[PDB]
Coordinates of N, CA and C in Angstrom, one line a residue:
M1 N -5.0 -2.6 -16.2 CA -4.6 -2.2 -14.9 C -4.3 -3.5 -14.0
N2 N -3.3 -3.3 -13.1 CA -2.9 -4.4 -12.2 C -2.3 -3.7 -11.0
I3 N -2.0 -4.5 -10.0 CA -1.6 -4.0 -8.6 C -0.4 -3.1 -8.8
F4 N 0.6 -3.5 -9.7 CA 1.8 -2.6 -9.8 C 1.4 -1.3 -10.3
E5 N 0.7 -1.2 -11.4 CA 0.3 0.1 -12.0 C -0.6 0.9 -11.0
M6 N -1.5 0.2 -10.3 CA -2.3 0.8 -9.3 C -1.4 1.5 -8.3
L7 N -0.5 0.8 -7.7 CA 0.4 1.4 -6.7 C 1.3 2.5 -7.3
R8 N 1.8 2.3 -8.5 CA 2.5 3.4 -9.1 C 1.7 4.7 -9.2
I9 N 0.4 4.6 -9.5 CA -0.4 5.7 -9.5 C -0.5 6.3 -8.1
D10 N -0.7 5.5 -7.1 CA -0.9 6.0 -5.8 C 0.4 6.5 -5.1
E11 N 1.5 6.0 -5.5 CA 2.8 6.3 -4.9 C 3.7 7.2 -5.6
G12 N 3.6 7.2 -7.0 CA 4.5 8.0 -7.7 C 5.9 7.4 -7.8
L13 N 6.9 8.2 -8.2 CA 8.3 7.8 -8.3 C 9.2 9.0 -8.0
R14 N 10.0 8.9 -7.0 CA 11.0 9.9 -6.7 C 12.3 9.2 -6.4
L15 N 13.4 9.7 -7.0 CA 14.7 9.0 -6.9 C 15.6 9.5 -5.8
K16 N 15.2 10.5 -5.1 CA 15.9 11.1 -4.0 C 15.1 10.9 -2.7
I17 N 15.8 10.7 -1.6 CA 15.1 10.6 -0.3 C 14.1 11.7 -0.1
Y18 N 12.9 11.4 0.3 CA 11.8 12.4 0.5 C 11.0 11.9 1.7
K19 N 10.2 12.8 2.3 CA 9.3 12.4 3.4 C 7.9 12.1 2.9
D20 N 7.4 11.0 3.4 CA 6.0 10.6 3.0 C 5.0 11.4 3.7
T21 N 3.7 11.1 3.6 CA 2.6 11.9 4.1 C 2.7 11.9 5.6
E22 N 3.3 11.0 6.3 CA 3.5 11.0 7.7 C 4.8 11.6 8.2
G23 N 5.6 12.2 7.3 CA 6.9 12.8 7.6 C 8.0 11.8 7.7
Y24 N 7.9 10.6 7.2 CA 8.9 9.5 7.3 C 9.7 9.4 6.1
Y25 N 11.1 9.3 6.2 CA 11.9 9.2 5.1 C 11.6 7.9 4.2
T26 N 11.6 8.2 2.9 CA 11.0 7.3 1.9 C 11.8 7.5 0.6
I27 N 11.8 6.5 -0.3 CA 12.4 6.7 -1.6 C 11.7 5.9 -2.6
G28 N 11.8 6.2 -3.9 CA 11.4 5.4 -4.9 C 9.8 5.4 -5.0
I29 N 9.2 4.2 -5.1 CA 7.8 4.1 -5.2 C 7.2 3.7 -3.9
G30 N 7.2 4.7 -3.0 CA 6.7 4.5 -1.6 C 7.5 3.5 -0.8
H31 N 8.8 3.4 -1.0 CA 9.6 2.5 -0.1 C 10.0 3.3 1.2
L32 N 9.3 2.9 2.3 CA 9.6 3.5 3.6 C 11.0 3.0 4.0
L33 N 11.9 4.0 4.3 CA 13.2 3.7 4.8 C 13.3 3.5 6.3
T34 N 12.7 4.4 7.0 CA 12.7 4.4 8.5 C 11.7 5.4 9.0
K35 N 11.3 5.2 10.2 CA 10.5 6.2 11.0 C 11.3 7.0 11.8
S36 N 12.6 6.8 11.8 CA 13.5 7.6 12.6 C 13.6 9.0 12.0
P37 N 13.7 10.1 12.8 CA 13.9 11.4 12.3 C 15.3 11.7 11.8
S38 N 16.2 10.7 11.9 CA 17.6 10.9 11.5 C 17.7 10.6 10.0
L39 N 18.1 11.6 9.2 CA 18.3 11.4 7.8 C 19.5 10.5 7.6
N40 N 20.5 10.5 8.5 CA 21.6 9.6 8.4 C 21.1 8.1 8.6
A41 N 20.2 7.9 9.5 CA 19.7 6.5 9.7 C 18.9 6.1 8.4
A42 N 18.2 7.0 7.8 CA 17.5 6.7 6.5 C 18.5 6.4 5.4
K43 N 19.6 7.2 5.3 CA 20.6 6.9 4.3 C 21.3 5.6 4.5
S44 N 21.5 5.2 5.7 CA 22.1 3.9 6.0 C 21.1 2.8 5.6
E45 N 19.8 2.9 5.9 CA 18.8 1.9 5.5 C 18.8 1.8 4.0
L46 N 18.9 3.0 3.3 CA 18.9 3.0 1.8 C 20.1 2.2 1.3
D47 N 21.3 2.5 1.8 CA 22.5 1.8 1.3 C 22.4 0.3 1.5
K48 N 21.9 0.0 2.7 CA 21.7 -1.5 3.0 C 20.7 -2.1 2.0
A49 N 19.6 -1.4 1.7 CA 18.6 -1.9 0.8 C 19.0 -2.0 -0.7
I50 N 19.9 -1.1 -1.1 CA 20.3 -1.1 -2.5 C 21.6 -1.9 -2.7
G51 N 22.4 -2.0 -1.6 CA 23.7 -2.7 -1.7 C 24.8 -1.9 -2.2
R52 N 24.8 -0.6 -2.0 CA 25.9 0.3 -2.4 C 25.7 1.6 -1.7
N53 N 26.8 2.4 -1.8 CA 26.8 3.8 -1.2 C 26.0 4.7 -2.2
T54 N 24.7 4.9 -1.9 CA 23.9 5.6 -2.8 C 24.0 7.1 -2.7
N55 N 24.4 7.6 -1.6 CA 24.4 9.0 -1.3 C 22.9 9.6 -1.4
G56 N 22.0 8.8 -0.9 CA 20.6 9.3 -0.9 C 19.9 9.4 -2.2
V57 N 20.5 8.8 -3.3 CA 19.9 8.9 -4.6 C 20.0 7.5 -5.3
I58 N 18.9 7.1 -5.9 CA 18.9 5.8 -6.6 C 18.4 6.0 -8.0
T59 N 18.6 5.0 -8.9 CA 18.1 5.0 -10.2 C 16.7 4.4 -10.3
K60 N 16.0 4.6 -11.4 CA 14.7 4.1 -11.6 C 14.6 2.6 -11.5
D61 N 15.6 1.9 -12.1 CA 15.7 0.4 -12.0 C 15.8 0.0 -10.5
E62 N 16.6 0.7 -9.7 CA 16.7 0.4 -8.3 C 15.4 0.7 -7.6
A63 N 14.7 1.8 -7.9 CA 13.4 2.0 -7.3 C 12.4 0.9 -7.7
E64 N 12.4 0.5 -8.9 CA 11.5 -0.6 -9.3 C 11.8 -1.9 -8.6
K65 N 13.1 -2.1 -8.4 CA 13.5 -3.4 -7.7 C 12.9 -3.4 -6.3
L66 N 13.1 -2.3 -5.5 CA 12.5 -2.2 -4.2 C 11.0 -2.4 -4.2
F67 N 10.4 -1.8 -5.3 CA 8.9 -1.8 -5.4 C 8.5 -3.2 -5.6
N68 N 9.1 -4.0 -6.5 CA 8.8 -5.4 -6.7 C 8.9 -6.2 -5.4
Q69 N 10.0 -5.9 -4.7 CA 10.2 -6.6 -3.4 C 9.0 -6.2 -2.4
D70 N 8.7 -4.9 -2.4 CA 7.6 -4.5 -1.5 C 6.3 -5.0 -1.8
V71 N 5.9 -5.1 -3.1 CA 4.6 -5.7 -3.5 C 4.6 -7.2 -3.1
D72 N 5.7 -7.9 -3.4 CA 5.8 -9.3 -3.0 C 5.6 -9.4 -1.5
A73 N 6.3 -8.6 -0.7 CA 6.2 -8.6 0.7 C 4.8 -8.4 1.2
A74 N 4.1 -7.5 0.6 CA 2.7 -7.2 1.0 C 1.8 -8.4 0.7
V75 N 2.0 -9.1 -0.4 CA 1.2 -10.2 -0.7 C 1.5 -11.4 0.2
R76 N 2.8 -11.7 0.4 CA 3.2 -12.7 1.3 C 2.7 -12.5 2.7
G77 N 2.8 -11.2 3.1 CA 2.3 -10.9 4.5 C 0.8 -11.1 4.6
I78 N 0.0 -10.8 3.6 CA -1.4 -11.1 3.6 C -1.6 -12.6 3.8
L79 N -0.9 -13.4 3.0 CA -1.1 -14.9 3.0 C -0.7 -15.5 4.3
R80 N 0.3 -14.9 5.0 CA 0.7 -15.5 6.3 C -0.1 -15.0 7.5
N81 N -1.0 -14.0 7.3 CA -1.7 -13.4 8.4 C -3.1 -14.0 8.5
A82 N -3.4 -14.6 9.7 CA -4.6 -15.3 9.9 C -5.9 -14.5 9.8
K83 N -5.8 -13.2 9.9 CA -7.0 -12.3 9.7 C -7.1 -11.9 8.2
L84 N -6.0 -11.7 7.5 CA -6.1 -11.2 6.2 C -6.3 -12.3 5.2
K85 N -5.7 -13.4 5.4 CA -5.7 -14.5 4.4 C -7.2 -14.9 4.0
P86 N -8.1 -15.2 5.0 CA -9.4 -15.6 4.6 C -10.1 -14.5 3.8
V87 N -9.9 -13.3 4.1 CA -10.6 -12.2 3.4 C -10.0 -12.1 1.9
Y88 N -8.7 -12.1 1.8 CA -8.0 -12.1 0.5 C -8.5 -13.3 -0.3
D89 N -8.5 -14.5 0.2 CA -8.9 -15.6 -0.6 C -10.4 -15.6 -1.0
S90 N -11.2 -14.8 -0.3 CA -12.6 -14.7 -0.6 C -12.9 -13.7 -1.7
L91 N -11.9 -12.8 -2.0 CA -12.1 -11.7 -2.9 C -11.7 -12.1 -4.4
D92 N -12.3 -11.4 -5.3 CA -11.9 -11.4 -6.7 C -10.6 -10.7 -6.9
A93 N -10.0 -10.8 -8.1 CA -8.7 -10.3 -8.3 C -8.6 -8.8 -8.2
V94 N -9.6 -8.0 -8.6 CA -9.5 -6.6 -8.5 C -9.6 -6.2 -7.0
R95 N -10.5 -6.7 -6.2 CA -10.6 -6.4 -4.8 C -9.4 -6.9 -4.1
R96 N -8.8 -8.0 -4.5 CA -7.5 -8.4 -3.9 C -6.4 -7.3 -4.0
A97 N -6.4 -6.7 -5.2 CA -5.5 -5.6 -5.4 C -5.7 -4.4 -4.4
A98 N -7.0 -4.1 -4.2 CA -7.3 -3.1 -3.2 C -6.8 -3.4 -1.8
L99 N -6.9 -4.7 -1.4 CA -6.4 -5.1 -0.1 C -4.8 -5.0 -0.1
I100 N -4.2 -5.5 -1.2 CA -2.7 -5.4 -1.3 C -2.3 -3.9 -1.1
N101 N -3.0 -3.0 -1.8 CA -2.7 -1.6 -1.8 C -2.8 -1.1 -0.3
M102 N -3.8 -1.4 0.4 CA -3.9 -1.0 1.8 C -2.7 -1.5 2.6
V103 N -2.3 -2.8 2.4 CA -1.2 -3.4 3.2 C 0.1 -2.7 2.8
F104 N 0.3 -2.4 1.5 CA 1.4 -1.7 1.1 C 1.6 -0.4 1.8
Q105 N 0.4 0.4 1.9 CA 0.5 1.7 2.5 C 0.7 1.6 4.0
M106 N -0.1 0.8 4.7 CA -0.1 0.9 6.2 C 0.4 -0.4 6.9
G107 N 0.7 -1.4 6.2 CA 1.3 -2.6 6.8 C 0.3 -3.6 7.2
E108 N 0.7 -4.9 7.2 CA -0.1 -6.0 7.5 C -0.8 -5.9 8.8
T109 N -0.1 -5.5 9.9 CA -0.8 -5.4 11.2 C -1.8 -4.3 11.2
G110 N -1.6 -3.2 10.6 CA -2.6 -2.1 10.5 C -3.8 -2.5 9.9
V111 N -3.7 -3.1 8.7 CA -4.9 -3.6 8.0 C -5.7 -4.7 8.7
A112 N -4.9 -5.6 9.3 CA -5.6 -6.7 10.0 C -6.4 -6.2 11.2
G113 N -6.1 -5.0 11.7 CA -7.0 -4.5 12.7 C -8.3 -3.9 12.3
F114 N -8.5 -3.8 10.9 CA -9.8 -3.2 10.4 C -10.9 -4.3 10.5
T115 N -11.1 -4.9 11.7 CA -11.9 -6.1 11.9 C -13.3 -6.0 11.2
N116 N -14.0 -4.9 11.5 CA -15.4 -4.7 11.0 C -15.4 -4.6 9.5
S117 N -14.5 -3.8 8.9 CA -14.4 -3.7 7.5 C -14.1 -5.0 6.8
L118 N -13.1 -5.7 7.4 CA -12.8 -7.0 6.8 C -13.9 -8.0 6.8
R119 N -14.7 -8.0 7.9 CA -15.9 -8.9 7.9 C -16.9 -8.5 6.9
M120 N -17.2 -7.2 6.7 CA -18.1 -6.8 5.6 C -17.6 -7.2 4.3
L121 N -16.3 -7.1 4.0 CA -15.7 -7.5 2.8 C -15.9 -9.0 2.6
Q122 N -15.6 -9.8 3.7 CA -15.8 -11.2 3.6 C -17.3 -11.6 3.3
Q123 N -18.2 -10.8 3.8 CA -19.6 -11.0 3.6 C -20.1 -10.5 2.2
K124 N -19.2 -9.8 1.5 CA -19.5 -9.2 0.2 C -20.6 -8.1 0.3
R125 N -20.6 -7.4 1.4 CA -21.5 -6.3 1.6 C -20.7 -5.0 1.2
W126 N -20.6 -4.8 -0.1 CA -19.6 -3.9 -0.6 C -19.9 -2.4 -0.2
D127 N -21.1 -2.0 -0.3 CA -21.4 -0.6 0.0 C -21.2 -0.4 1.5
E128 N -21.6 -1.4 2.3 CA -21.4 -1.3 3.7 C -19.9 -1.2 4.1
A129 N -19.1 -2.1 3.5 CA -17.7 -2.1 3.7 C -17.1 -0.8 3.3
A130 N -17.5 -0.2 2.2 CA -17.0 1.1 1.8 C -17.3 2.2 2.8
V131 N -18.5 2.2 3.3 CA -18.9 3.2 4.4 C -18.0 3.0 5.6
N132 N -17.8 1.7 6.0 CA -17.0 1.5 7.2 C -15.5 1.8 7.0
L133 N -15.0 1.5 5.9 CA -13.6 1.8 5.6 C -13.2 3.3 5.7
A134 N -14.2 4.1 5.4 CA -14.0 5.6 5.5 C -14.0 6.2 6.9
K135 N -14.5 5.5 7.8 CA -14.4 5.9 9.2 C -13.1 5.5 9.8
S136 N -12.0 6.2 9.4 CA -10.7 5.8 9.7 C -9.7 6.9 9.6
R137 N -8.7 6.9 10.5 CA -7.6 7.8 10.3 C -7.0 7.8 8.9
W138 N -6.9 6.6 8.3 CA -6.4 6.4 7.0 C -7.2 7.3 6.0
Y139 N -8.5 7.2 6.0 CA -9.3 8.0 5.1 C -9.1 9.5 5.3
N140 N -9.0 9.9 6.6 CA -9.0 11.3 6.9 C -7.6 11.9 6.5
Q141 N -6.5 11.1 6.6 CA -5.2 11.6 6.3 C -4.9 11.5 4.8
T142 N -5.3 10.5 4.1 CA -5.1 10.4 2.7 C -6.4 10.1 2.0
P143 N -7.3 11.1 2.0 CA -8.7 10.9 1.5 C -8.8 10.6 0.0
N144 N -8.0 11.2 -0.8 CA -8.1 10.9 -2.3 C -7.6 9.5 -2.6
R145 N -6.5 9.1 -2.0 CA -6.1 7.7 -2.2 C -7.1 6.7 -1.6
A146 N -7.5 7.0 -0.4 CA -8.5 6.1 0.3 C -9.7 6.0 -0.6
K147 N -10.2 7.1 -1.1 CA -11.4 7.0 -1.9 C -11.2 6.1 -3.1
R148 N -10.0 6.2 -3.8 CA -9.8 5.3 -4.9 C -9.8 3.8 -4.5
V149 N -9.1 3.5 -3.4 CA -9.1 2.1 -2.9 C -10.5 1.7 -2.5
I150 N -11.2 2.5 -1.8 CA -12.5 2.2 -1.4 C -13.5 1.9 -2.6
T151 N -13.4 2.8 -3.6 CA -14.2 2.6 -4.8 C -13.9 1.2 -5.4
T152 N -12.6 0.8 -5.3 CA -12.2 -0.5 -5.9 C -12.9 -1.6 -5.1
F153 N -12.9 -1.5 -3.8 CA -13.6 -2.5 -3.0 C -15.1 -2.4 -3.3
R154 N -15.7 -1.2 -3.4 CA -17.1 -1.1 -3.6 C -17.5 -1.8 -4.9
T155 N -16.8 -1.5 -6.0 CA -17.3 -1.9 -7.4 C -16.6 -3.1 -7.9
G156 N -15.4 -3.5 -7.4 CA -14.7 -4.6 -8.0 C -14.2 -4.2 -9.4
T157 N -14.1 -2.9 -9.8 CA -13.6 -2.5 -11.0 C -12.4 -1.6 -10.8
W158 N -11.8 -1.2 -11.9 CA -10.7 -0.2 -11.9 C -11.1 1.2 -12.2
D159 N -12.4 1.5 -12.0 CA -12.9 2.8 -12.5 C -12.2 3.9 -11.9
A160 N -11.8 3.8 -10.6 CA -11.1 4.9 -9.9 C -9.7 5.2 -10.4
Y161 N -9.1 4.3 -11.1 CA -7.8 4.4 -11.6 C -7.7 4.7 -13.1
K162 N -8.8 4.9 -13.8 CA -8.9 5.2 -15.2 C -9.2 6.7 -15.4

């Protein structure tokens, strides 16, 4: 298991524009196109991202390309963020993947606001961090995925993805 396979499990793969759990136009492996309610704005973002007139449909290779870019962006965003970098650097590789997963789903600014959870993770108080992470809109809106990510932080294993 690795961060890419982990996110493929959590995000799936759809080759036509679809709405995410928040109602936002998305494509591929959880590639957010826009928060605008305009499907035309979403199709324009898609064509810009792929480099061609896609007509709202992409190939698997194209979806995987955006996914690689998005994972890279999540990691780079963690490393550039003064709140996330110390936590990330303190974690082992499996728990680093859990943090990347959160940032992929909700964005660097959103995760960086989880101040108390991040501190518990930095302190390696895993059960306490897990309890605190669940007191969130994130957990309430996507509980099955949040449970998997939280178990990964709690245990430092891939048990929730096997």
